Design an enzyme around this catalytic site. Structure first.
Site, mmCIF file in Angstrom:
data_model
loop_
_atom_site.group_PDB
_atom_site.id
_atom_site.type_symbol
_atom_site.label_atom_id
_atom_site.label_comp_id
_atom_site.label_asym_id
_atom_site.label_seq_id
_atom_site.Cartn_x
_atom_site.Cartn_y
_atom_site.Cartn_z
ATOM 1 N N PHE A 1 -3.023 6.977 -0.507
ATOM 2 C CA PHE A 1 -4.289 6.868 -1.475
ATOM 3 C C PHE A 1 -4.400 5.619 -2.485
ATOM 4 O O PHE A 1 -4.955 5.851 -3.664
ATOM 5 C CB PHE A 1 -4.393 8.326 -2.496
ATOM 6 C CG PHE A 1 -4.617 9.423 -1.590
ATOM 7 C CD1 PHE A 1 -3.155 10.122 -1.561
ATOM 8 C CD2 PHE A 1 -5.603 9.648 -0.826
ATOM 9 C CE1 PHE A 1 -3.381 11.278 -0.656
ATOM 10 C CE2 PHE A 1 -5.542 10.774 -0.140
ATOM 11 C CZ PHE A 1 -4.514 11.682 0.014
ATOM 12 N N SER B 1 0.676 -1.200 0.073
ATOM 13 C CA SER B 1 0.180 0.115 0.059
ATOM 14 C C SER B 1 0.796 1.238 -0.101
ATOM 15 O O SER B 1 1.911 1.253 0.406
ATOM 16 C CB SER B 1 -0.873 0.034 1.040
ATOM 17 O OG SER B 1 -1.986 -0.740 0.944
ATOM 18 N N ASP C 1 5.865 13.163 5.377
ATOM 19 C CA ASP C 1 5.429 11.832 5.737
ATOM 20 C C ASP C 1 6.783 11.016 5.558
ATOM 21 O O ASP C 1 6.529 9.812 5.450
ATOM 22 C CB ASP C 1 4.260 11.284 4.850
ATOM 23 C CG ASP C 1 3.687 10.122 5.581
ATOM 24 O OD1 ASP C 1 3.865 9.984 6.870
ATOM 25 O OD2 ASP C 1 3.101 9.051 5.104
#
Ligand code: FNI
Length: 262
Positions: free
Chosen positions: A21, A18, A129
């Site tokens: 988004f 993952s 991030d």
């Protein structure tokens, strides 16, 4: 000059995990590539805005230490295509398969990461991030910083106190990136995720937010240089204004690296 890719050219293989988004896949497009898709189905303007944001940021980046954006596709599914790195993220290395790197190698990983961030900041790009999950180690010796879905011009362990306690509109800054980088310095020098002796994610968020909790810098291995331990404390400062900017950070890591192998 455009970077759009016609439907059919991209071949999607293994689902590897993952990303902001969406879902990351291994793919084929003029060789091995990473492909991140932001669908299933017709996309929301939510997705649309996230897609156009990241693409816009990526086409602004050309640097060794930044995951090479290669192209994008909308036609079948909103997809972003970058280069492929065999051998996983710094996170996977450190906390999953437990690769024990040498200090010379660990410092190098820090210098290269600092190198990419300096570039991003000199371009007015804030990653927002930065974490070991987004630091990919290509062919075991070149750091590439990836995932720019959140960037502009819940992974909490890397969040600055200001960011934790969502005060005012914008808590995110160069300094918050510096802080997140501080935690990767921690992960690199300790081999651990911080606060590992507390098994409550919420108590961690509350505590760091109010400044009761900070990373225990006594856990750095004894062969880690004092100057690195010193720089780490500077990045991990509770007040964002007391943190150094990446130009200064980079110069610090370069210096200690020079007078080290002896
Ligand atoms: O996810 C991965 N590796 C994992 C993930 C989870 N667990 C183990 N390994 C993963 O493995 C990779 C190998 N090469 C390049 C990129 C990745 C990558 N991640 C990403 C992250 C964000 C992307 C993006 O924002 C746009 C395009 C591609 C992207 C690829």
């Amino acid at each position: 000059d455009d970077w759009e890719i016609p439907d059919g050219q991209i071949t999607v293989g293994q689902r590897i995990g993952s990303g902001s988004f969406g879902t990351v896949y291994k793919g084929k497009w003029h060789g091995d590539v990473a492909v991140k898709m932001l669908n299933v189905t017709a996309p929301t303007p939510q997705q649309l805005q996230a897609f156009k944001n990241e693409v816009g940021v990526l086409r602004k980046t050309r640097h060794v230490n930044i995951l090479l954006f290669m192209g994008y596709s909308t036609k079948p599914q909103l997809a972003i295509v970058t280069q492929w790195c065999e051998g996983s993220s710094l996170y996977h290395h450190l906390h999953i398969i437990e690769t024990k790197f040498e200090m010379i190698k660990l410092i190098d990983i820090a210098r290269q990461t600092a190198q990419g961030m300096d570039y991003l900041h000199a371009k007015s790009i804030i990653h927002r991030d930065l974490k070991s999950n987004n630091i990919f180690l290509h062919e075991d010796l070149t750091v590439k910083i990836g995932d720019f879905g959140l960037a502009t011009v819940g992974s909490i362990l890397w969040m600055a106190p200001e960011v934790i306690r969502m005060q005012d509109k914008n808590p995110y800054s160069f300094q918050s990136d510096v802080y997140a980088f501080g935690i990767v310095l921690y992960e690199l020098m300790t081999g651990q995720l911080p606060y590992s002796n507390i098994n409550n994610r919420d108590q961690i968020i509350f505590m760091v937010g109010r400044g009761y909790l900070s990373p225990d810098l006594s856990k750095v291995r004894s062969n880690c240089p004092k100057a690195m331990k010193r720089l780490m404390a500077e990045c991990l400062k509770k007040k964002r204004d007391e943190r150094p900017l990446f130009p200064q950070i980079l110069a610090s890591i370069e210096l200690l690296a020079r007078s080290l192998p002896k």
